Design a binder for these strands. Structure first.
Length: 51
DNA sequence: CGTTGCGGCAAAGTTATGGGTAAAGTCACACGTAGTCACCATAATGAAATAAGATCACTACTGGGCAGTACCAGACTCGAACTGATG
């Protein structure tokens, strides 16, 4: 919720295209109790350049 | 005393013993005495042998695991489509 509202101005399509993951997985991560894969987690972290 | 036998006294006589001195005997110098088996215990090896030890080979007995098979879901991911806000 923080990262989408920080640089993606509350949108998921830009974030999904930036990280390449389909938007369905983005919605699953951001809305339900679905834990993103570790590779996906730290790829998002690298996109944010934060540990 | 007058005579006769007996006994003491003190040289005198006879044996014995440890010394000295000339003189008849005595005997080694003659190449020669050391020299040679017999003897049985102890060290001392070197060989004979060990008594056990070392390993091979076989026979039988008994633990016991690996490549592979199989199901029942839970959970994340995402084609494919639905549907609402918008410039």
């Amino acid at each position: 919720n923080i990262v989408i509202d920080k640089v993606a101005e509350n949108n998921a399509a830009a974030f999904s295209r930036l990280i390449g993951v389909p938007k369905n997985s983005l919605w699953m991560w951001q809305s339900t109790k679905t834990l993103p894969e570790l590779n996906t987690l730290l790829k998002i972290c690298y996109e944010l350049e934060i540990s």
